[PDB]
Design a protein around this nucleic acid. Structure first.
Ligand SMILES: [Mg+2]
Ligand SMILES: [Mg+2]
Ligand SMILES: [Mg+2]
Ligand SMILES: [Mg+2]
Ligand SMILES: [Zn+2]
Ligand SMILES: [Zn+2]
Lengths: 351, 550, 550, 351
DNA sequence: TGGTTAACCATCGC
DNA sequence: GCGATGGTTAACCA
DNA sequence: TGGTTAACCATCGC
DNA sequence: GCGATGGTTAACCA
DNA sequence: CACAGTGCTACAGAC
DNA sequence: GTCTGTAGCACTGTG
DNA sequence: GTCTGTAGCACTGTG
DNA sequence: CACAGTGCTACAGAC
């Protein structure tokens, strides 16, 4: 495993610490950007290509029938794999709007039509939500489940602004973990029912969810109530039956304690967890190969790539999987005159 | 000796650093004293009265989503950012007054003057306590090139956005059925001492996340404030006020990103109306104001949702340039200053174009263009006494806009019909110049308001006729606004240039001196004392101590 | 009330604009007065007793080719450019005091303290009036970035040159046969309050034409001044002074420009000695000081005439860097400030180099260099509390070279025998820092002066051995001087830092505050006021009114 | 008779209002760069070449025998034409030094060897001056005369700093015309004897001299004492005779009044006089063809090249002949950020 | 062909 | 001087 | 070949 | 941030 | 080892 | 027991 | 007859 | 039609 230093060339100003990289049908797409969409990209979504150490972003046109979503910073992303009816979609909810807000509306992003030369039209359809609807929240997680054999989307984690009644103009950006209720989201129709957990006494945030057949493993994430990061690992197992879903959750109390982790799929269900943070002054250097066995998740430590001094001593860092075992990370840089590109980029690869 | 408050006014009005004032005080005390000035501490406790979070007050009904505590002073503008390494960063340094408290300390500052009005108006000071209305101009401007200090951190941007407000007028209404009588009408809204700094940041205004993240709570305060009536004990009697907000004295770049437009040089030029670029150059003078905040909102909602499934450009044409979501209401209007400067830069272009002859040579090289400008600035240096500025300040703009200045350009221009053309042009422009500059056009310049529309028709037909080579498919933003929408907004608002950004931008000059002269100075507390000393600079209660009439 | 002069110094020493002073005055008079302060006109009248061209004096013999009129105030520095269109332009604006008159004001202003020295020395004030000697530090510095004013003209550059002087000491020698006794020894030469502005220009300093044109007369009256003795009635008794002139506190670009040397990064890296770069890299520490003005002139004659008929490079290697003709004689010395700064920028480079191993990889990509600076500054701000800087300021340079910051950058460098390499390096450097930078090394820090040479030997071969990959064929100018010529000078002077560029380049801050707030402001009349008000700022007689025994 | 605008490419920073273009052996050489020579040019002399609207400057190395002269601003230039055994010289005296001073050392410049790539090695020999030496002065002129058949130089005009009595710190940069005495300069040996005669009541300055066959014609100068520009025209007639020279001078009833004029030698002895100024504000526009007949000088007014607005409305302007009936002029340019080309250049051509 | 992707220029406002 | 729009032109991957 | 040749570089100080 | 030195490399006139 | 501030809280020396 | 005055704090701007 | 106070001047800095 | 200065000379209104 090794790292390749990247040059941002042009378009380096459109990445901000929260953002997304969606891997679908070959090329991966940058989602979310600094500020509102400019006219260079009316959509806001960028196709990204990496060639010979060069990181390139390009505009993505939208199909006529599509909506246009705002550049949400910390949305919950779930890859909805190719199957009936329509392959293959990246599910996004709900992120946080550049004009500062939380979009409570869930976006459904699909590939529509190619060609010709490196050109893909994407269609964005927000799915209206009947409920029981979930609150506006950000930095949480969402992931896909398949049970007997009906498919749904499990939603959990996150933060929100202080509830409308207790929110001040003095305390606003005060932000609390949301209550520990999962949402089972039927992707058709928009009914997503709330569900309470006997085993969850606290709201979790920036946690990293992984999923395989009718099962989701929530790898540890920051708690703002107690200001600590649980080493415990959450397992939940859902069974979808007409007319009511039954969710059961259990704890496997040893695992990684991490926050803001980059999950890059390498093998079939086995991701490597690159990973964000140990403590709030400490960032995780040690990389964790995570396989998913029907018996249970297991994580082998992989020998971490050699860290060049810069990424070793940085205060904060962020990124996303390019896919295919390869991921992209970014280190904020400073000197004046301003860099101008606020982030240096690294590519990192397994095997 | 001297009264403490009077002395404190002597201090903040003469721009005296507390260190320098302690130097002076110590000296006059030790040498022939019998001290006159009051020592620093009595000054510090004397100014407790003036600063916000002093006078007790209450809104009715109680404000939505606001703190009821009235004694709160300077607050860190973060407003509770949880400063997780994981979340969005804490990079900003900000200090602001909670809006309503600032407002009461600024208005309870005018208590003497509103009593003055009530006495002078021969109204009973005891009668009609609750019929008050108060018109206030809020303003916001970004100011670049702010040196970062070494500090403990956080690492923080070199741009600083400054946000303030001025109280323009207070007028009674009740009984009712009337004009309402004007108790107080500010004499010089274009003065920096009329402008009270509300908020202070280090943020770039092109960085939308952070800016909306700071100014969000403020805007909330506004949306609450529009409803409830204020209640203050004033002049001895407890009285009830109302509040009208005019968002004005924004530059256009700021309006557009705050009103959520596509900006600023796009093919959708106007803030107020929907006309395109070429569409506007085709017919200039005839336009009607349409787009407002509520409208911009519903337009965003029909963009983001896009119900009729149009592609990028047709959808962009349906909403006329609404892509972003506006988070803030701004009363539609033209800045006096930036519009002046804009028109002056366009005229700079035209002069340049008439130095050589550019309608004869449709596409000249860059070389003789630079040549042309050098000609123009040599000439403008000789006559009109003008340095060749880099970015054009409004002062330049005022100096070059004259018949007198246009004459200097008339000298170089080869032919007579052109030489006469731009002269006639400038005359036309100066006849229409005071309507968006002068404080209250209805009276101050009645005929130039009366004859505006005809005059702009004249101007535009001069463009379309003799200047068409430039203006064929294009016209500038501000030049469009000033050749279209002036009569409308004057006869609606009643004034323009009275609402000018001038008061606010001037404030920026004060900021710098205060940061350099009256700061702490370190990144932890700087905005603290900048904002404080600045708020103490604007207070009328000190200022009329400085009058000491005659 | 209170005395006029005391009040005048309540103003000048507190940075009060005369308009502002009048504001306060009017207020305190009108409110409970019984006026305290004196009105502006008696202040203006009072400060005529300080400013040069006041006290009558005489020289013997008469100063060669200088005017004998002693009442002359501010002169336009032009010295009467004939301003024919056809000749060299009149572009420059300048205001200067005639040198000697300035001096006699800045001295008779020290009359009280010089008599104080006499009575304190238990010398008789009536005896020995002839044997006085005065050592004065003249200084010059360029200051870029000055805004033009729109003005009447003439077109004038955006750069300024500000030339000043400080009186360092006065000592009595006669009877004779002695050390000479120090009557007055300045306590803080590094203060802006000790530096009196003598001359003010709007000129680029790399523009040799105009600089030599305006600064010419100054140097001439210098060449006259060092010979004749001054005669001043002081303390009631007419006394006779001698003058000693130390050119010091120049930047090196300025130095090289003024002595006609190569600038500044050429193959001849020394102002005080003849060694090239390679020669200096081989043997670092052993060099004897050679260069001086007179033989620099002889060198220019050797170059210009080229008597032995040699090829260009052979001639330039013979005369060793002398092409231009020297205008002005300066002492052979090292500026403390720019040396701290320059050694700090060198060290910035070394740390930057020791992040990624740069001796393992003979050359890097520019990209990973940028990477190295990014990590360096990010960490530096993290621990040492230092923002990244565009230029190297002295303050940064002081917070930089410490054990603290080196142990801050010792976290990054992965090799553990390199760590104590640059750590021990910094320890050595710190041990040799105060010898140049202290006010009086012989006294203040005797053992560090005592052990300097050995210490610099250690430093030098630490470079030559461990760091050689960088320093093989090259080294910095300042880093060369400081590893060679410090011990030579401090036993030729008694100090280095006492003579530094701090007093002068602290005077720029005052130039900008004064021009900005205490000037006219018109391009014509402004320099007059900057210069006058500044000279009034530096005066001791006005300064001692500001404690009056605390 | 037309103008073309030139672009100065790199290095326009080395031209200043006083300067000199020397036309010898084909190519012409710029002289007197701004300030002291930077080591990019240790000599201080630039070969100038103009191709396709482009003005170019090139360093000129000096031969081993040469003295390296300072970049003098307004020296008296006289082309000493090729003959036994000299060829071929440009005589320069004295100009005024960048460190502001006046030289009073007469430099004799000549060509030495070439090319091989058409480099030109030049040699500068200051000639020591026996007898009464012409005082340090600048902006004057010097010209070559040939009589029966001995060849010599004639020196006249110019200003100087105040004589070392009136000399002052307050009056310094103030100058005054030098006394009206010509100097007859024998170019071998360095003997130059001063001469005077009543018809010169004042020193002219910035005048232009023309030289043909032992006669020199001085076009109107600038007089400082009476501050005016004489329409009178000076004609001096020198007979070189062993062992004493005889100079007789006279006036022309009417003629041209111009200061700081450029002279380009179109024909044999006939130059188009481009010309600097008719007045202390108004600058000379019309161009004057000046032929030299044995009978007497005559001036035909030539139709002036159509001026672009800029060169017509400039306050000051300057230049020198490239030769070949072609000359180079420059207009100071203002705008900020500084261009940073302090002068726009124009080429102007006859026929 | 096609659209990248740059690249440049001129536009417009700060 | 800085950032974003918009159109023409031009480089480049299929 | 030869000397630009404009360039680009890293060097040094302001 | 700008300006000048020095050497390596690379474009170009003959 | 620049220096004179830069405004404020802390805690002493003074009637 | 109140009033007054300097020291502590980190950091400035001129390079 | 002296002392005091505002107006004239061109132009500033914030954009 | 910005405004509050910016220091100085000029000349008036005041004991
Ligand atoms: Mg702005
Ligand atoms: Mg300097
Ligand atoms: Mg300098
Ligand atoms: Mg602005
Ligand atoms: Zn419009
Ligand atoms: Zn040396």
């Amino acid at each position: 495993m090794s790292l390749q230093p990247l040059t941002a060339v042009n378009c380096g100003s459109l990445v901000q610490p929260g953002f997304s990289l969606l891997d679908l049908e070959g090329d991966v797409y940058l989602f979310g950007q600094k500020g509102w969409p400019k006219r260079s990209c009316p959509t806001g979504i960028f196709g990204v290509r990496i060639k010979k150490g060069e990181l390139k972003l390009r505009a993505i046109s939208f199909s006529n029938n599509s909506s246009y979503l705002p550049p949400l910073r910390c949305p919950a992303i779930a890859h909805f794999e190719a199957q009936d009816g329509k392959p293959e979609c990246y599910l996004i909810h709900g992120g946080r709007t550049p004009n500062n807000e939380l979009s409570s509306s869930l976006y459904m992003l699909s590939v529509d039509s190619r060609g010709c030369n490196r050109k893909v039209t994407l269609r964005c359809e927000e799915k209206e939500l009947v409920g029981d609807v979930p609150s506006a929240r950000y930095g949480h997680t969402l992931s896909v489940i398949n049970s007997r054999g009906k498919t749904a989307c499990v939603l959990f984690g996150g933060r929100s602004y202080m509830p409308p009644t207790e929110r001040t103009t003095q305390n606003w950006n005060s932000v609390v973990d949301c209550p520990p209720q999962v949402y089972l989201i039927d992707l058709e129709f928009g009914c997503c029912t709330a569900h309470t957990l006997p085993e969850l006494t606290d709201g979790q945030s920036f946690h990293v969810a992984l999923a395989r057949q009718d099962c989701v493993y929530f790898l540890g994430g920051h708690i703002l109530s107690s200001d600590c990061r649980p080493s415990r690992l959450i397992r939940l197992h859902v069974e979808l039956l007409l007319g009511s879903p039954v969710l059961t959750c259990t704890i496997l109390h040893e695992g990684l304690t991490i926050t803001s982790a980059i999950a890059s799929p390498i093998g079939y269900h086995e991701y490597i967890i690159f990973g964000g943070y140990q403590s709030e002054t400490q960032k995780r250097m040690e990389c964790t190969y995570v396989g998913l066995d029907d018996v249970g998740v297991h994580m082998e430590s992989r020998e971490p790539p050699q860290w060049t001094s810069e990424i070793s001593h940085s205060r904060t860092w962020f990124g996303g999987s390019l896919g295919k075992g390869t991921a992209l990370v970014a280190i904020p840089s400073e000197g004046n005159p301003t860099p101008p590109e606020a982030y240096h980029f690294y590519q990192v690869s397994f095997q | 000796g001297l009264h403490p408050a009077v002395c404190l006014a002597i201090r903040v009005n003469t721009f005296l650093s507390c260190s320098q004032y302690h130097k002076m005080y110590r000296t006059v005390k030790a040498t022939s004293g019998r001290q006159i000035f009051q020592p620093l501490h009595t000054l510090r406790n004397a100014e407790k009265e003036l600063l916000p979070g002093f006078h007790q007050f209450e809104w009715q009904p109680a404000l939505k989503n606001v703190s009821t505590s009235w004694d709160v002073g300077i607050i860190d503008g973060l407003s509770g950012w949880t400063v997780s390494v994981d979340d969005v960063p804490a990079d900003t340094i900000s200090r602001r007054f909670r809006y309503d408290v600032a407002l009461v300390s600024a208005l309870k500052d005018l208590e003497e003057d509103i009593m003055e009005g009530l006495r002078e108006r021969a109204l009973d000071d005891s009668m009609c306590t609750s019929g008050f209305t108060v018109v206030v101009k809020e303003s916001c401007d970004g100011m670049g090139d702010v040196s970062e200090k070494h500090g403990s951190g956080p690492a923080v941007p070199e741009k600083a956005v400054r946000f303030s407000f001025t109280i323009m007028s207070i007028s009674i209404r009740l009984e009712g059925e009337d004009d309402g009588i004007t108790i107080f009408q500010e004499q010089k809204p274009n003065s920096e001492l009329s402008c009270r700094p509300l908020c202070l940041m280090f943020v770039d205004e092109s960085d939308h996340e952070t800016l909306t993240a700071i100014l969000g709570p403020v805007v909330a305060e506004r949306k609450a404030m529009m409803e409830s009536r204020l209640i203050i004990s004033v002049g001895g009697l407890l009285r009830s006020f109302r509040f009208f907000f005019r968002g004005t004295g924004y530059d256009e770049k700021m309006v557009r990103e705050m009103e959520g437009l596509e900006a600023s040089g796009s093919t959708y030029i106007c803030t107020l109306c929907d006309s395109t670029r070429a569409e506007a150059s085709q017919n200039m003078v005839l336009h009607s104001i349409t787009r407002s905040h509520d409208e911009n909102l519903e337009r965003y909602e029909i963009w983001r949702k896009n119900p009729f499934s149009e592609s990028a450009d047709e959808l962009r044409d349906r909403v006329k340039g609404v892509s972003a979501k506006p988070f803030m209401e701004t009363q539609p209007t033209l800045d006096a200053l930036h519009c002046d400067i804009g028109n002056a830069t366009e005229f700079y272009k035209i002069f340049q174009d008439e130095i050589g002859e550019v309608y004869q040579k449709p596409n000249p090289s860059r070389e003789e263009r630079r040549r042309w400008r050098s000609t123009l600035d040599k000439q403008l240096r000789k006559k009109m006494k003008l340095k060749p500025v880099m970015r054009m300040n409004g002062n330049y703009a005022r100096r070059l806009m004259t018949r007198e200045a246009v004459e200097a350009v008339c000298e170089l221009v080869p032919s007579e019909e052109r030489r006469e053309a731009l002269l006639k042009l400038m005359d036309l422009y100066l006849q229409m110049k005071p309507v968006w500059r002068s404080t209250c056009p209805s009276r101050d310049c009645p005929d130039q308001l009366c004859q505006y529309s005809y005059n702009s028709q004249q101007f535009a037909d001069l463009l379309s006729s003799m200047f068409k080579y430039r203006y064929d498919g294009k016209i500038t933003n501000y030049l469009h606004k000033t050749l279209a929408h002036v009569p409308e907004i004057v006869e609606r608002d009643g004034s323009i240039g009275a609402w000018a950004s001038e008061g606010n931008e001037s404030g920026n000059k004060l900021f710098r001196r205060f940061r350099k002269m009256n700061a702490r100075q370190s990144k932890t507390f700087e905005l603290e004392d900048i904002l404080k000393h600045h708020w103490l600079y604007t207070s009328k209660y000190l200022q009329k101590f400085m009058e000491a009439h005659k």
